[PDB]
Ligand binder design. Sequence first.
Ligand SMILES: Nc1nc2c(ncn2[C@@H]2O[C@H](COP(=O)(O)OP(=O)(O)O)[C@@H](O)[C@H]2O)c(=O)[nH]1
Lengths: 454, 420, 158
Amino acid sequence: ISKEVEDCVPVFLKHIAHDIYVCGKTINLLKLCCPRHYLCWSDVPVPRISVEQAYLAGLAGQYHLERYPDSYESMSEPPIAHLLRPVLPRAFAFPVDPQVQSAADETAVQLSELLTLPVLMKRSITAPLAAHISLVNKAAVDYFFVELHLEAHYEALRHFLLMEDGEFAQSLSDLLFEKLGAGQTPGELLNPLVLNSVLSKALQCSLHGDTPHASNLSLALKYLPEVFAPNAPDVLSCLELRYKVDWPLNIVITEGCVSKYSGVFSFLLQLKLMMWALKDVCFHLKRTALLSHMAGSVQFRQLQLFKHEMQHFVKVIQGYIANQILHVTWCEFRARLATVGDLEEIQRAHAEYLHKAVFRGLLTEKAAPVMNVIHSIFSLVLKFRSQLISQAWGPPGGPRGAEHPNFALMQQSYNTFKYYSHFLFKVVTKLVNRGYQPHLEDFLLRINFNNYYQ
Amino acid sequence: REIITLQLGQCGNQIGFEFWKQLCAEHGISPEGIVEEFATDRKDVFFYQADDEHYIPRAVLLDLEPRVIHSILNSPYAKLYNPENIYLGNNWASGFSQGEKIHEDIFDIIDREADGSDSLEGFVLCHSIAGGTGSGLGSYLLERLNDRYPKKLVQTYSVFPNQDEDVVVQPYNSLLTLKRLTQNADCVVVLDNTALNRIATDRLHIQNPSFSQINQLVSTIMSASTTTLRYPGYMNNDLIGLIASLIPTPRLHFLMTGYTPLTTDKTTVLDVMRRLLQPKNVMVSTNHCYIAILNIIQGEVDPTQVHKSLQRIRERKLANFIPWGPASIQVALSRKSPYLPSAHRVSGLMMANHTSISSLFERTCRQYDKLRKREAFLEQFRKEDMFKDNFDEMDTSREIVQQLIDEYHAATRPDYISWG
Amino acid sequence: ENQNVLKNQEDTFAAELHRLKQQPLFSLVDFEQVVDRIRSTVAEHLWKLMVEESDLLGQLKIIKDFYLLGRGELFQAFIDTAQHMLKTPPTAVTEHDVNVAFQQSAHKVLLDDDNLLPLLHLTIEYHGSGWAALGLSYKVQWPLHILFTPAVLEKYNV
Ligand SMILES: Nc1nc2c(ncn2[C@@H]2O[C@H](COP(=O)(O)OP(=O)(O)O)[C@@H](O)[C@H]2O)c(=O)[nH]1
């Protein structure tokens, strides 16, 4: 803004030190991209140099449905193009009117005591520049937004990378999970072919839709696994969804920015992973189905419950993140997206659409402790539920704990999970009092809705 | 996977007829079964897709000695439901025996749809308890489905009948149905004729035509209970995830119903949530406590309100529960449809596991116990005696339902960790 | 002037001052006349903005409603619910404990509306009878900052 540290307060005032720099790069970018009707290089005009009952009910519904496009005409109102031009001759003629009085009054100001006003008042003469600046920013926004339909790119990235669309998220994770747990554990599930095959399969079977937007979707990996570990945790499996960006929005969406988007996919997937086996263990108890209903086992009843308690905690955790990010922060970003009116402004809305989602995610580094307890909790749930699957029931007579005789070991595990739960009840509070983490108030609020502990 | 609804019995066929009609207007559908021109939702589960967009519901309509049954056929929506799968006493035994001779053709009609669908996740029965033909036939079909299709999960929209207590054998018929339902239902959603009749008297002056008007009330609950499945969501998209939270122990699988707008014909979430916890909005008629509660709200809800709202209901404690299960109320949100009116755009429903429903089960068990001693209505009809000479299934049912009555109250106690 | 990111009488006034310069001998009355003409124009314009654009009547209602115990039901209840906590002696963690009690007291009256609460909190000081260190603080908007320098709120605190 200052030449070295030598800023010209006389000409820049340090005010247009930055504005001049911005307008220059934006006109050069839009024009660089292509002549647009509103500007089209020097096409801008005379800018002063200055410086059935169901069917009738259906028709009522048709009008209600048609009301939404009438409301959506307002969304599509900004790129008029033909009316944009009239504003400009009027728009630059309007400055001429101040510019008309200013020159004459400049003679009066010059006549009065050399300068009637302070020497610094000369900033009034350079003021018209702002007019060009306004036109530049507004124009860029339409090209960047309606012409390039940017919101849709954010909307799809949210849908597939943050897994908002429910069907797509469950299937891509589902096929992979069967394979990851089943075998092929030495990166035989990393065959580029299987990865691509599942991705296309996931995208096609999502049913939210097949679109030009679905393009640029890629299934990929970064760190290479030597082998998948016990419980097939893929606790950090480096499967990176990669999203290509077009030249203009390549500037709008920075590589570091999509680097952050990947993180949620990771944790969310692991949550889904946790979810998978549990549904399955209940399905496995339903696989036994006590099919020998002829024999009703007392121990069965007991375990039938241990599964539910561990299941109850993980359903709450997946719920907590969802409201915090899926409907609590995208709504905020959309209001900011509507508000942003300039390239720099657009960069900071998406920037905090994510700096915030990450903060509410708890993946933030300062919040490591809660994530750490989660790991211990999540590890126990994965490994111990896997044990009941390993064993098989036994002869039907009297009390029969021996059905899956390893059951005894699991009870010890049931108590370890509980120990962490109580600890987590104490951990969230330990942090809330020391500083301000308004987000964590929501965490604890849900964890113990009814008791010191459940 | 797509859901197949086995609507059976005259009463059950009446609420399936309306439920499908309710999703006809709510979804982009027409009486012919083709989509409307004016028409982002997940119609795959509930509606089969024909080649020319004839979205035909996967409804299985079972009829027995049909006379008023023909009324469903003489309707503008006769074309809408054309899987071409409809196949031809007031006693539970009379219904069970009739079902057994025709079991294989009705079961092949189940197979056809199962083969036709990409997949089949659950069988949702519009069951009528003590429904004359509807009960007995419904219990038998409940027993066959689990054996053949163990992998799938069953639900029952049981319209438990309470009319202030005509059927003189009503308690006996109901007693037998529950023993099967407890044993062979993965889930059951309970409704009450009197509870809804009391609501009808409350919201409206309608008293004498209680059955016709109450059909709309049962429907609004039924469409609403599956709206999260029918419309796209970030969570509980699958039926199973939803079912797990509502039923924490297998035996206690009966679910209570409520609607925040007793009259739906702005409101903040903090308000809509509080209405579910008032008993005037509930539709079901020693300490007692809920086992776990869930709620689904509809429309463009303001979200920040919910954090305030969820922490808000907590201070209010309007819902009192301390069961063996953890029991946090769960908050869900969905989109109100873009065809139907936006009047009362925000509108909610709650599905909850409550030990109070045990009392309704004990009242029919009370009528039956009184009736059993008198033996006033043993029927002794040759069908009844020949089918059941020992009459010991009623006693087998009595011990199984008493175990259920006992289990519920055990849930109220501090030690359901021990056997219940 | 700053915080922008108002009527232009500057010239008229510049002409006024310019004429003042031309006059040969100092006449305090004319200087006084022109200066107060301007002073008068700034205060009137300034008063309209703050009084209407940012209604002050409400702000004061809030200041008396809390600093001055103008809210009887809530303050009485706050004293009632947190009796023991405030009674016990001060330390570093009692501060959140009183505030959640003061928020708990806010919904205890049940007379609430959006926001209102965000602009108030309780401030306990320890190591320099908790009732002894209980201080109430308000968050002032920029326009009202001059009118409510900490000194006036500091006297209000007592
Ligand atoms: N909710 C509701 N229940 C009905 C309706 N009509 C009959 N019922 C119930 O159906 C039960 C008797 O079944 P019924 O009509 O005898 O079956 P049927 O043997 O096929 O005639 C009673 O318990 C009634 O409560 C209706 O329109 N709505």
